[PDB]
PDB file of C-alpha atoms in Angstrom:
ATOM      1  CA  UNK A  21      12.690  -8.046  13.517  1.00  0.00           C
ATOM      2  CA  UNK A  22       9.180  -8.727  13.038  1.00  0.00           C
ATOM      3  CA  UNK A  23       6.997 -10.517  15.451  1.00  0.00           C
ATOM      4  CA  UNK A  34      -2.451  -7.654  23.419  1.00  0.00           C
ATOM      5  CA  UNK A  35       0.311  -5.383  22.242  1.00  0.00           C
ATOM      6  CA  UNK A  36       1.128  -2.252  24.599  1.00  0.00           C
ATOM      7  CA  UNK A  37       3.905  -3.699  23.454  1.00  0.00           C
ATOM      8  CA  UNK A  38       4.097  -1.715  19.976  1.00  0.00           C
ATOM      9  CA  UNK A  39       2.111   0.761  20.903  1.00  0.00           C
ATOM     10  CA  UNK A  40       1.592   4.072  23.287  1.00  0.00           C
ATOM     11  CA  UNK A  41      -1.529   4.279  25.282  1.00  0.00           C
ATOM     12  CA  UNK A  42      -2.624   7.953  24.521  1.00  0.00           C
ATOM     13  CA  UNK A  43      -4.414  10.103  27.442  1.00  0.00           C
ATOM     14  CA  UNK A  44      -8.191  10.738  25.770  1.00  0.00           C
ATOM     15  CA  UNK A  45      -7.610  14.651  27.065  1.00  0.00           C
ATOM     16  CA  UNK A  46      -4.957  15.021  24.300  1.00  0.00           C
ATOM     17  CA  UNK A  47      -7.494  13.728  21.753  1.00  0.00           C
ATOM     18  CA  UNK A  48     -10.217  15.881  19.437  1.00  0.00           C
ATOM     19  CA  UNK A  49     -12.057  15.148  17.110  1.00  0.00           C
ATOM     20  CA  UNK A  50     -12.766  17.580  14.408  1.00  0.00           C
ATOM     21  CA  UNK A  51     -14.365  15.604  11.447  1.00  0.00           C
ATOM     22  CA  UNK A  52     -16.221  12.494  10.694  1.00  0.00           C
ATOM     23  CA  UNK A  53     -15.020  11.106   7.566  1.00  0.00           C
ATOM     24  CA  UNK A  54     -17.387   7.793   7.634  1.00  0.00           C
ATOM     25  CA  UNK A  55     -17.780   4.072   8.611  1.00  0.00           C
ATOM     26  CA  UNK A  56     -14.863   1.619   8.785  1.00  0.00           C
ATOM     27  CA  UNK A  57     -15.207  -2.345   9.244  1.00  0.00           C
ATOM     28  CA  UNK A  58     -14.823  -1.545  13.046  1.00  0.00           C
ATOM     29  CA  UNK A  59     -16.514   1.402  13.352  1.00  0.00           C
ATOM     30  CA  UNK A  60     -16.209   5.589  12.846  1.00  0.00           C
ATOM     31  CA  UNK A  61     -13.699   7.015  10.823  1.00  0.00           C
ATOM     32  CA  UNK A  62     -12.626  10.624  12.072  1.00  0.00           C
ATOM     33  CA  UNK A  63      -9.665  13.151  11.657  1.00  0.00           C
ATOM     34  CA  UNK A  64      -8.961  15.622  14.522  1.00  0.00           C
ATOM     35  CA  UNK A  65      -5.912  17.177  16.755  1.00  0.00           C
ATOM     36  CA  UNK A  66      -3.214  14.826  19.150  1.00  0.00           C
ATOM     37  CA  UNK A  67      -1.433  16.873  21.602  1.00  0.00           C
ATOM     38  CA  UNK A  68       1.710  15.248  21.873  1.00  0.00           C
ATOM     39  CA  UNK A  69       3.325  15.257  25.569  1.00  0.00           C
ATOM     40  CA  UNK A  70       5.743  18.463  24.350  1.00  0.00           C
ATOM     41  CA  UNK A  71       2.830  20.323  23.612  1.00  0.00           C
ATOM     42  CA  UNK A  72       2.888  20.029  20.211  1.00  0.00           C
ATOM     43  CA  UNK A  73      -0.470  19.934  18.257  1.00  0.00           C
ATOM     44  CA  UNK A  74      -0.422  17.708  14.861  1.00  0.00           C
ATOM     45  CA  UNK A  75      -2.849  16.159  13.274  1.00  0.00           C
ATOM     46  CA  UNK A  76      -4.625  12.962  13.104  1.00  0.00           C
ATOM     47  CA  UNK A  77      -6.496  10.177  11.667  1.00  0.00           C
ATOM     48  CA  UNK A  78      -8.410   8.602  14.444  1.00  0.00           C
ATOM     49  CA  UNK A  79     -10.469   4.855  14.034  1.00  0.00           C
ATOM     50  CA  UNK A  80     -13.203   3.621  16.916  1.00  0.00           C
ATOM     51  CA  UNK A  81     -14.443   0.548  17.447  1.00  0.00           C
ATOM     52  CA  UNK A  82     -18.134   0.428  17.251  1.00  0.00           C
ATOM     53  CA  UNK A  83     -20.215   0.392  20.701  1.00  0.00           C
ATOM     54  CA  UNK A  84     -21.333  -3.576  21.323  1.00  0.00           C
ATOM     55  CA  UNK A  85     -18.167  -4.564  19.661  1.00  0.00           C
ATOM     56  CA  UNK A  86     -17.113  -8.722  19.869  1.00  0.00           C
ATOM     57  CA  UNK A  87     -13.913  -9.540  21.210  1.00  0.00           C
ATOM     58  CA  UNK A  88     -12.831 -10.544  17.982  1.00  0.00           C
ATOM     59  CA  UNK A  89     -13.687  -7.434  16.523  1.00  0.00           C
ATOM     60  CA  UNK A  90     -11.571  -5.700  19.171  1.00  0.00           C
ATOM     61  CA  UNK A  91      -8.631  -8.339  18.582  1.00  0.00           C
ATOM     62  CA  UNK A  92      -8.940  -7.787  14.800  1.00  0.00           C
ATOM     63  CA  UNK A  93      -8.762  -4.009  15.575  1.00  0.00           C
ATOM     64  CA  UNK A  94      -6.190  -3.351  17.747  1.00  0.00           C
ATOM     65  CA  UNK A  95      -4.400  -6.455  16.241  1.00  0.00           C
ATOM     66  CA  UNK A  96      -3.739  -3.911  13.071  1.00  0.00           C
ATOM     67  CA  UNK A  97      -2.435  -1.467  15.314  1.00  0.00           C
ATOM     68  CA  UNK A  98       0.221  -4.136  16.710  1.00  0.00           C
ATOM     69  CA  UNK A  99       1.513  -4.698  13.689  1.00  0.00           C
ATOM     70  CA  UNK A 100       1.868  -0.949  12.732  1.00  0.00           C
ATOM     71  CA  UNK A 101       3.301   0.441  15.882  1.00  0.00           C
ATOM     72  CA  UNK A 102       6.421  -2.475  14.795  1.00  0.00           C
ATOM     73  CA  UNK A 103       7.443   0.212  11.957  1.00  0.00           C
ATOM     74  CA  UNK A 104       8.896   3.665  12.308  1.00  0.00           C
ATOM     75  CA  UNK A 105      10.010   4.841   8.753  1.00  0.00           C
ATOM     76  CA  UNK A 106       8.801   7.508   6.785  1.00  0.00           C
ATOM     77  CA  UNK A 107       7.080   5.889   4.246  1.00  0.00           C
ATOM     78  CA  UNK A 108       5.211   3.430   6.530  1.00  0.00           C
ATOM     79  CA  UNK A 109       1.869   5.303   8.202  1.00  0.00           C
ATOM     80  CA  UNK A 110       2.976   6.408  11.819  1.00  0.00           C
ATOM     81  CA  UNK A 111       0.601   4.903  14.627  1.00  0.00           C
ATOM     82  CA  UNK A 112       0.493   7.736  17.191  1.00  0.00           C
ATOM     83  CA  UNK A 113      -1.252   5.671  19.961  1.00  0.00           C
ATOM     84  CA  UNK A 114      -3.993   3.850  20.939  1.00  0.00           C
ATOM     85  CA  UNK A 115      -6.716   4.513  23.582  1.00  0.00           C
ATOM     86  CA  UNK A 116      -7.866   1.420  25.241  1.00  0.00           C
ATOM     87  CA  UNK A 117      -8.464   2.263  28.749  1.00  0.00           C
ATOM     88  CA  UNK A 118     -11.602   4.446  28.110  1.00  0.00           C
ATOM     89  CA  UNK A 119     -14.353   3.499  25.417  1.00  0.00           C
ATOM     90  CA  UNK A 120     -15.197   3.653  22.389  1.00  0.00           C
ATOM     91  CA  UNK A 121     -11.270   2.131  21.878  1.00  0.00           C
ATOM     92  CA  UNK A 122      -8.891   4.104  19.388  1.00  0.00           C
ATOM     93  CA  UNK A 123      -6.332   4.239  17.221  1.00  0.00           C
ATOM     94  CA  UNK A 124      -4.904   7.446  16.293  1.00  0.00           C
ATOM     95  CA  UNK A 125      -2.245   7.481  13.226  1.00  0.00           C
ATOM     96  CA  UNK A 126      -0.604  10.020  10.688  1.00  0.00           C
ATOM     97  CA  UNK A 127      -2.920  12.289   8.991  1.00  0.00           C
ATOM     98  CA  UNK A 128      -2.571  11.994   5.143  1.00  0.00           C
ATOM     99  CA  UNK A 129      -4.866  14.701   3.405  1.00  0.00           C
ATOM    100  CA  UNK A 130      -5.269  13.467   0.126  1.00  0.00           C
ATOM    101  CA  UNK A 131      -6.187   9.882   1.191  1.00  0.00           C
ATOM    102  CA  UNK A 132      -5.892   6.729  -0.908  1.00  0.00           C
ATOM    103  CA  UNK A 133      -3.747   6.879  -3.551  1.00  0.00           C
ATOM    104  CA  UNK A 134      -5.866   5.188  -6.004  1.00  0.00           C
ATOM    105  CA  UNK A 135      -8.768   7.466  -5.529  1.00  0.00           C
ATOM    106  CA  UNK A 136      -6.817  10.810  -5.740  1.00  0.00           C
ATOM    107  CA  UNK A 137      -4.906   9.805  -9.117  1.00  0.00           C
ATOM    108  CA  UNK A 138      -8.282   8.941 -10.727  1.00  0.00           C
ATOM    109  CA  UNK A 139      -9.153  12.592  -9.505  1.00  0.00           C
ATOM    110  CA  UNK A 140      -6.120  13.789 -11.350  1.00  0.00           C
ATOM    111  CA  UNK A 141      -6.053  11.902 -14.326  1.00  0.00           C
ATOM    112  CA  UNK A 142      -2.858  12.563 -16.652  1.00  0.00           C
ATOM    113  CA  UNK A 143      -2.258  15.983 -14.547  1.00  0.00           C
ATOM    114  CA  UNK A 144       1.680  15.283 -12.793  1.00  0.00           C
ATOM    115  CA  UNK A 145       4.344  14.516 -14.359  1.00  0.00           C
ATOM    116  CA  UNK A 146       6.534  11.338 -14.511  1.00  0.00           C
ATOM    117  CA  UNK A 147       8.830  12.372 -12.010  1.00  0.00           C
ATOM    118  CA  UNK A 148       6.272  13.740  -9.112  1.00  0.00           C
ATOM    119  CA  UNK A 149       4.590   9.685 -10.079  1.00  0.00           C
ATOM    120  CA  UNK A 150       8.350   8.159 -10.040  1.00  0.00           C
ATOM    121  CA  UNK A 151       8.846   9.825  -6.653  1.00  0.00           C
ATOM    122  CA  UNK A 152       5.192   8.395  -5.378  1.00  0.00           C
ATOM    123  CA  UNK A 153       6.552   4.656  -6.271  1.00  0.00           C
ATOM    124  CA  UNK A 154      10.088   5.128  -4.948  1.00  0.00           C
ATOM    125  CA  UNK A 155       8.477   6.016  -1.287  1.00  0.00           C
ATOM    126  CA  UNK A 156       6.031   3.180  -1.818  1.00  0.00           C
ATOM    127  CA  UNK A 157       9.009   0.637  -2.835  1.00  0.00           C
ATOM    128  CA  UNK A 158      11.242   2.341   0.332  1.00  0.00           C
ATOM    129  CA  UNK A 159       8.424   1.413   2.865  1.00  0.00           C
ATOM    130  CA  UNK A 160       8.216  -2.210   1.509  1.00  0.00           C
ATOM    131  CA  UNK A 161      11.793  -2.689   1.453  1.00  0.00           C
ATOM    132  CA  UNK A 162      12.166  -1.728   5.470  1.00  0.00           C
ATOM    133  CA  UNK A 163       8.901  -3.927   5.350  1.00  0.00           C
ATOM    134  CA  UNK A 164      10.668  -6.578   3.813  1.00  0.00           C
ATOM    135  CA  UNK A 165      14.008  -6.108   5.668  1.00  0.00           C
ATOM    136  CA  UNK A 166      11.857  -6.826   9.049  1.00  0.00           C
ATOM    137  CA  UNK A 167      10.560  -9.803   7.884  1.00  0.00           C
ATOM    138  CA  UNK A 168       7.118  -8.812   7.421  1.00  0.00           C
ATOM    139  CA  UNK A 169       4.851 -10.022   4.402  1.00  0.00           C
ATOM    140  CA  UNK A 170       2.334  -7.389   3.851  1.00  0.00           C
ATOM    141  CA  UNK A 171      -0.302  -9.880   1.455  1.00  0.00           C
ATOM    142  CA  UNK A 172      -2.554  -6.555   0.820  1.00  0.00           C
ATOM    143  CA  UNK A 173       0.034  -4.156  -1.109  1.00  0.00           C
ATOM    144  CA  UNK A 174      -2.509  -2.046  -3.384  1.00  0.00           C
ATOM    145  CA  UNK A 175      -2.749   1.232  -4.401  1.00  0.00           C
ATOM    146  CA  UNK A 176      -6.000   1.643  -2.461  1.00  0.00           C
ATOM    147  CA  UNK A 177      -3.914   0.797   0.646  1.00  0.00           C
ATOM    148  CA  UNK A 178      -1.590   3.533   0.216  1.00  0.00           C
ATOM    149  CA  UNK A 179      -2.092   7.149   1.650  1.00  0.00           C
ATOM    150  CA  UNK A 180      -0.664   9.878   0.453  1.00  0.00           C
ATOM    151  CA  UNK A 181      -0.216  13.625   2.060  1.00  0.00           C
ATOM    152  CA  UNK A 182      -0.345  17.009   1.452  1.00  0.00           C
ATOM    153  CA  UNK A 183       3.071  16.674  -0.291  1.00  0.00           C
ATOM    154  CA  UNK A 184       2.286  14.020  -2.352  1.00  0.00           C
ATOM    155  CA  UNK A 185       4.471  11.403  -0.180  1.00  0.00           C
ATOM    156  CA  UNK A 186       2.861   7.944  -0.118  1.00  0.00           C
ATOM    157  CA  UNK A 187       3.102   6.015   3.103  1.00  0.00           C
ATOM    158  CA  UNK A 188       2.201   1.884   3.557  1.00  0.00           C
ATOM    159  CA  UNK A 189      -1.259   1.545   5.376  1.00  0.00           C
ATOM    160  CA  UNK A 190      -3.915  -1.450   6.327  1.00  0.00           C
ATOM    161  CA  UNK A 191      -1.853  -4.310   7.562  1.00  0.00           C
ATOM    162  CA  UNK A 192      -5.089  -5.973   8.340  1.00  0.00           C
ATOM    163  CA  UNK A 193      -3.901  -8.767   6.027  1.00  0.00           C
ATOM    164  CA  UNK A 194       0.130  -8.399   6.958  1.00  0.00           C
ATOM    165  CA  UNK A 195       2.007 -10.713   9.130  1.00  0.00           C
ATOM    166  CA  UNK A 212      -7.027 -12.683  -1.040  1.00  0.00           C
ATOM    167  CA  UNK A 213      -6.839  -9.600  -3.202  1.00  0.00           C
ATOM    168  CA  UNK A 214      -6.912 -11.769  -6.802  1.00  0.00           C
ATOM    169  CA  UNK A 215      -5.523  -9.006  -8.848  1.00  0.00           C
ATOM    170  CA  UNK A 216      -2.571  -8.064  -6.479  1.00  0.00           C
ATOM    171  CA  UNK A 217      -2.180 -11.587  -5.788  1.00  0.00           C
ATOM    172  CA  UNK A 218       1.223 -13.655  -7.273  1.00  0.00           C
ATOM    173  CA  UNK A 219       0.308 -16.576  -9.398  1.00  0.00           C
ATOM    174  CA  UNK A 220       2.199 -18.895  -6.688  1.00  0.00           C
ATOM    175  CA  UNK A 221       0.173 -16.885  -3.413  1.00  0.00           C
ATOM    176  CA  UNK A 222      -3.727 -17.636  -5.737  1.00  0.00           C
ATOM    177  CA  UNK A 223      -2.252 -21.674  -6.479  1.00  0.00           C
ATOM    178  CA  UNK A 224      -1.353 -22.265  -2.965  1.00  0.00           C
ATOM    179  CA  UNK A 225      -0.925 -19.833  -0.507  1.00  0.00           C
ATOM    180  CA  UNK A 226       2.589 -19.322  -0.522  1.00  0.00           C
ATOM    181  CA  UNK A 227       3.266 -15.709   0.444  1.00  0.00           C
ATOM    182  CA  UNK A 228       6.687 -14.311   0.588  1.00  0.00           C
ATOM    183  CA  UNK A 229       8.572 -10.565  -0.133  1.00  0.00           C
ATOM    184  CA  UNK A 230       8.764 -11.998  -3.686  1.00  0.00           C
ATOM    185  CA  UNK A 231       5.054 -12.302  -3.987  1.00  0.00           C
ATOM    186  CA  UNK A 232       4.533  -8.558  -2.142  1.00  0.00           C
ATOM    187  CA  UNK A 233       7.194  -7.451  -5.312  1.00  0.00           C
ATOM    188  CA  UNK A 234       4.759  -9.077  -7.812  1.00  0.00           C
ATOM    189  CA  UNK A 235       1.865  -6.973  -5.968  1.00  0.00           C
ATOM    190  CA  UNK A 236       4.386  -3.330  -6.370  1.00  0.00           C
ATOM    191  CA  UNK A 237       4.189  -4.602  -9.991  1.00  0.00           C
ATOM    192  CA  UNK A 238       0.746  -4.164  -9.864  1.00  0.00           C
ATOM    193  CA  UNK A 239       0.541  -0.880  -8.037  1.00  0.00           C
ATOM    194  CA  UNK A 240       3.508   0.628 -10.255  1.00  0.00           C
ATOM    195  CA  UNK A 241       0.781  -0.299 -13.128  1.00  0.00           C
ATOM    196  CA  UNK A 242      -1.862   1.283 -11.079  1.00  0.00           C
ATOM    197  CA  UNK A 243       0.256   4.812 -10.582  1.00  0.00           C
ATOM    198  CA  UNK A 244       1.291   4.493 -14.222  1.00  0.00           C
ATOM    199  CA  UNK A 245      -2.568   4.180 -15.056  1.00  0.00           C
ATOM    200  CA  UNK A 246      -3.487   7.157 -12.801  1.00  0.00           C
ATOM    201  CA  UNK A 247      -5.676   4.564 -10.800  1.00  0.00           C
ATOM    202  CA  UNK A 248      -7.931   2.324 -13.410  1.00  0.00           C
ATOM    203  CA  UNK A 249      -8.605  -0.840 -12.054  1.00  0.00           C
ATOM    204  CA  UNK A 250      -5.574  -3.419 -12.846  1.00  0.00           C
ATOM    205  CA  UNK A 251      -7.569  -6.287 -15.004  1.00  0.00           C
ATOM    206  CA  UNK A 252     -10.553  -3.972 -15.172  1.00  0.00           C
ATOM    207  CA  UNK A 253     -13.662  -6.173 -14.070  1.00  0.00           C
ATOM    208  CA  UNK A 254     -12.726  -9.554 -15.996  1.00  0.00           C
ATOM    209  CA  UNK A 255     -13.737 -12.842 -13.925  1.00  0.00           C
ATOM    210  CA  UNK A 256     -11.906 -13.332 -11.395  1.00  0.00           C
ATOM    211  CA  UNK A 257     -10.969 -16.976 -12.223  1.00  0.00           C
ATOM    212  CA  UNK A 258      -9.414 -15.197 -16.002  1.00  0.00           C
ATOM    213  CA  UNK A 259      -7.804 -13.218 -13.894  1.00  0.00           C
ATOM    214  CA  UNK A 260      -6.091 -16.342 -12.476  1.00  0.00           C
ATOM    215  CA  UNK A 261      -6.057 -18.302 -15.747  1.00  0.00           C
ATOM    216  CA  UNK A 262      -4.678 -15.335 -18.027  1.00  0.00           C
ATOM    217  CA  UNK A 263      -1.703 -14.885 -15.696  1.00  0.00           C
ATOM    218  CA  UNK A 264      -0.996 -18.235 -15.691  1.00  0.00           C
ATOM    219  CA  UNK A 265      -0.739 -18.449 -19.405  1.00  0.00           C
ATOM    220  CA  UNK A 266       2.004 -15.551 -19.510  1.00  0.00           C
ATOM    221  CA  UNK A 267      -0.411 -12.616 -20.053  1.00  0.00           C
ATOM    222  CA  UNK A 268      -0.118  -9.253 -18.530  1.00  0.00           C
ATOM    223  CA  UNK A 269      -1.382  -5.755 -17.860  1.00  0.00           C
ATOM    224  CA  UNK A 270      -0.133  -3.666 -20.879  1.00  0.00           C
ATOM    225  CA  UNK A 271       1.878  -0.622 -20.507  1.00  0.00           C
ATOM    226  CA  UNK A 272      -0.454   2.434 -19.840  1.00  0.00           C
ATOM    227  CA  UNK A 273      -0.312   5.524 -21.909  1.00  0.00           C
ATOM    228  CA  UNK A 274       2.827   7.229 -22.416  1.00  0.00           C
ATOM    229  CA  UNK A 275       4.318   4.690 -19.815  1.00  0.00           C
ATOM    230  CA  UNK A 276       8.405   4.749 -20.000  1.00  0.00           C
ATOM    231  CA  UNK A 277      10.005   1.991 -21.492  1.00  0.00           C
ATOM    232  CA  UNK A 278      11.984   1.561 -17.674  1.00  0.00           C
ATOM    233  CA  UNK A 279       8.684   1.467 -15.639  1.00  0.00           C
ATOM    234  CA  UNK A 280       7.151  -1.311 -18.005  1.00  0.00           C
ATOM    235  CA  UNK A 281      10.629  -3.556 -18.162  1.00  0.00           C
ATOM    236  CA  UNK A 282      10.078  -3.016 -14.199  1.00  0.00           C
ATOM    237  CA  UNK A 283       6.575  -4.326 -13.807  1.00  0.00           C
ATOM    238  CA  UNK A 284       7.160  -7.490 -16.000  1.00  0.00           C
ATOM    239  CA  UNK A 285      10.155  -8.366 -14.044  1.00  0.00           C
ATOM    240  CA  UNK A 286       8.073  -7.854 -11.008  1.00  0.00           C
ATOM    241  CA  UNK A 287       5.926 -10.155 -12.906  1.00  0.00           C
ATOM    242  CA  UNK A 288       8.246 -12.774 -13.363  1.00  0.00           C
ATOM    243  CA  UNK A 289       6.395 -16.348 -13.376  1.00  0.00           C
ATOM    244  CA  UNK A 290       9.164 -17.263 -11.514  1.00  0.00           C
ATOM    245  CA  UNK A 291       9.368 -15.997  -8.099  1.00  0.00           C
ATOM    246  CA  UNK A 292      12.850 -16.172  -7.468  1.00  0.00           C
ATOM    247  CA  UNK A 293      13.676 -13.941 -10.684  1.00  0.00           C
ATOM    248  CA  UNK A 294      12.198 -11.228  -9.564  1.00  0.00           C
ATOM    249  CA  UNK A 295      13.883  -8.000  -8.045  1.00  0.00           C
ATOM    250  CA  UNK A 296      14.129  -7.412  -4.449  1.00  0.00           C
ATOM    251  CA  UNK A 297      12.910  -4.442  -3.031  1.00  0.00           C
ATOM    252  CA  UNK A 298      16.367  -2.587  -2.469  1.00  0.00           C
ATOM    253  CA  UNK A 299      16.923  -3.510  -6.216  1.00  0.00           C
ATOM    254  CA  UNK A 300      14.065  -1.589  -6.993  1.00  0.00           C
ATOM    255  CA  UNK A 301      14.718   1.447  -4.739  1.00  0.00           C
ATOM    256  CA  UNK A 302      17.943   1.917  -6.710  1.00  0.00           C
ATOM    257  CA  UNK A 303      16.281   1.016 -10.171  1.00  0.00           C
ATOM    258  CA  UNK A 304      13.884   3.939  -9.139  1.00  0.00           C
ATOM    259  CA  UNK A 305      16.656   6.069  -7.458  1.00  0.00           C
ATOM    260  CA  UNK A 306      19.007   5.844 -10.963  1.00  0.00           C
ATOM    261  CA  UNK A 307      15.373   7.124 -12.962  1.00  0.00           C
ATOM    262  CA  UNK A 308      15.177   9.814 -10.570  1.00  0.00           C
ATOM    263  CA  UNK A 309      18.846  10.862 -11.183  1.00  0.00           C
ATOM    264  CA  UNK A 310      18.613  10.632 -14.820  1.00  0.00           C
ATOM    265  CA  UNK A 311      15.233  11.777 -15.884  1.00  0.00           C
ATOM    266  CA  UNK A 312      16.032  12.203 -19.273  1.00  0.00           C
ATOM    267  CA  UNK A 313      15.910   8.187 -18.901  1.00  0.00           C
ATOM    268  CA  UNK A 314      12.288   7.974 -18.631  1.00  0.00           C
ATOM    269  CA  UNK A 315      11.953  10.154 -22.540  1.00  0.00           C
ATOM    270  CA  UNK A 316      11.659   6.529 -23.779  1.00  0.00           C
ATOM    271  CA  UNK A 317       8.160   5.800 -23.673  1.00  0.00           C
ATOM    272  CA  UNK A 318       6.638   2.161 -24.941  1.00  0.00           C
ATOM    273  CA  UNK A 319       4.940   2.485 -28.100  1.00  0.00           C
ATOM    274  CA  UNK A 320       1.047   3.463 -28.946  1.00  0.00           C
ATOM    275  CA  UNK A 324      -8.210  -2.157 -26.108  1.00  0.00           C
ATOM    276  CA  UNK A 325      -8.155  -3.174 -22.593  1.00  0.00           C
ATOM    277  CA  UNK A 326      -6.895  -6.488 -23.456  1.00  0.00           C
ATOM    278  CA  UNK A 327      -3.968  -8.641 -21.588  1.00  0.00           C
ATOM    279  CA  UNK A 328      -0.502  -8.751 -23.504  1.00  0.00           C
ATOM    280  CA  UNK A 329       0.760 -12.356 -23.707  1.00  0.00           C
ATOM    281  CA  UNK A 330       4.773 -11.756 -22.154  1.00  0.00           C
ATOM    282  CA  UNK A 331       5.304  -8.500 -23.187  1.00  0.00           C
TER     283      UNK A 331
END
């Protein structure tokens, strides 16, 4: 059920807003965290964006245009857009607050330190997000570890659906050749991030050329199974890896391939066996 849009999103009073810490720069300007008081009184908080002073109407389009999108999901493991502010400047957008940030960054801070089931828990909230994602109609194009968040609790949430309605390495052989951008080719990009949890956040392909990247792929190579990966999660990136697009799982297939690993933990003893080079297949 996917489609200016007040339409998808609250218009937040400015009152309710503060701002406690800048974090940095964005592409559309500051990136702070602060306090929302919601219209109950409650006090949570926030992540807050601004669009830079002297902004272009396409860079408010482009910026608000993200928040459109976002404000079309309400599920736990898609980021929450709180509001917007849009009737006094600078122009916000206030979402979820997620403490530890990108998910990329904080497992390279934490390098072999959880275990497999606080990781398999990470990717089953990841693949639960893209299958309501999915179920809506929605074709995310950006789905990277670097674009999930993930919170105090270690629950990862979807984020930056700049992109949604190219990223080379997250990219499906069939979205690189021409374009062609489906659920299937957002599965082939969880294949990649499942690699990238797995991996505690190296870079998937490392910094080969881009156009090996493409070519390597193409002749049946892949990433290889990280360090003490289980046996499951590697069968489950290569079939989310499948050349062919239509043999891949869905996302509600992978939920429950997740949720059955979760049950049975004792499944995920079987690790694959023992260099950052490509495995051809395999």
């Amino acid at each position: 059920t996917f489609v200016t849009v007040h339409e998808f999103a609250k218009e937040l009073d400015a009152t309710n807003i503060s701002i406690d810490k800048v974090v940095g720069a964005g592409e559309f300007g500051e990136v702070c965290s602060g306090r929302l008081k919601l219209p109950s009184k409650k006090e949570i908080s926030v992540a807050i964006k601004t669009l830079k002073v002297g902004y272009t109407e396409k860079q408010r389009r482009d910026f608000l245009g993200e928040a459109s999108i976002m404000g079309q999901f309400d599920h736990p493991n898609i980021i929450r857009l709180e509001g917007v502010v849009t009737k006094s400047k600078p122009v916000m957008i206030v979402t979820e607050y997620m403490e530890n940030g990108s998910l990329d960054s904080f497992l390279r801070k934490h390098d072999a330190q959880f275990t497999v089931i606080q990781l398999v828990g990470m990717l089953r909230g990841i693949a639960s997000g893209m299958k309501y994602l999915s179920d809506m109609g929605a074709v995310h194009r950006d789905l990277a570890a670097r674009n999930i968040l993930i919170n105090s609790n270690l629950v990862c949430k979807v984020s930056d659906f700049g992109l949604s309605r190219i990223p080379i390495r997250w990219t499906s052989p069939e979205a690189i050749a021409y374009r062609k951008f489906t659920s299937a080719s957002d599965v082939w990009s969880y294949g990649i991030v499942l690699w990238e949890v797995m991996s505690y956040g190296e870079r998937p392909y490392w910094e080969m050329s881009n156009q090996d990247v493409i070519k390597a792929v193409d002749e049946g190579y892949r990433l290889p199974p990280p360090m003490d990966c289980p046996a499951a999660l590697y069968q489950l990136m290569l079939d989310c890896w499948q050349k062919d697009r239509n043999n891949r799982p869905k996302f509600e297939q992978i939920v429950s391939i997740l949720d059955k690993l979760i049950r049975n933990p004792g499944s995920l003893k079987i690790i694959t066996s023992a260099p950052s080079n490509l495995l051809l297949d395999q």
